[PDB]
Amino acid sequence: QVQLVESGGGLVQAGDSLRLSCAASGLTFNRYNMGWFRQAPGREREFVASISWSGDRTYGTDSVKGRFAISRDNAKNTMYLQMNSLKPEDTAVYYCAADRFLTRSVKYDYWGQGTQVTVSS
């Protein structure tokens, strides 16, 4: 079956940087758009960033585009999210997802279990 596994979460302090990764198996990795979503306490699940199989990057808002960077390594079936200047508001569970057509919609076909990021001040 298809399997997406996130890692790299933990407890950081405000202003820190953090790199999350996502490893995929059971699909032909280079034919899928890959996306990061998050769910903060008291909020709905929301789009963070996406990188399509042709390499175009799409970001959620101005709150994200300046601080976060997304990339993929097709040779290793892995994608990464680099997060800089983290704030308490970024505390959330971060999910990796894959889909053959979608970009910003939360209705992607495949989902990982998520990794938890806590940011304290």
DSSP strands (E only) in 1-121: 3-7, 10-13, 18-25, 33-39, 46-51, 57-59, 68-73, 78-83, 92-99, 110-111, 115-120
Total domain count, the chain: 1
Burial of 40 (0-12, 13-18, 19+ CB in 10 A): middle
DSSP state of 101: S
The CB density around residue 115, as the number of other CB atoms within 10 Å, is 19
Angle at 44 between CA 13 and CA 23, to 5 degrees: 65
Give the Å distances, CA to CA, from 54 to 12, 17, 94, 116. Answer: 33, 27, 23, 29
Query: 77: which 2 tokens?
Result: 């079936």
Domain holding 102, by residue range, is 1-121
DSSP state, 75?
G
Whole-number Cα distances in Å, 3 to 30, 38, 109, 110, 117: 15, 18, 12, 8, 21
How many angstroms separate the CA atoms of 67 and 105, rounded?
21
Closest CA to 33 of 43, 24, 45, 46: 24
How many other C-beta atoms can be found within 10 angstroms of the C-beta atom of residue 4?
Answer: 22
Output phi, psi for 29, to 5 deg: -55, -40
Question: Angle at Cα 33 formed by Cα 113 and Cα 103, nearest 5°?
Answer: 95
**What is the CB neighbour count within 10 angstroms for residue 39?**
14
Q: Under a CB-based contact definition with an 8 Å cutoff, are residues 35 and 99 in contact?
A: yes
106 burial level (CB within 10 Å; 0-12, 13-18, 19+): middle
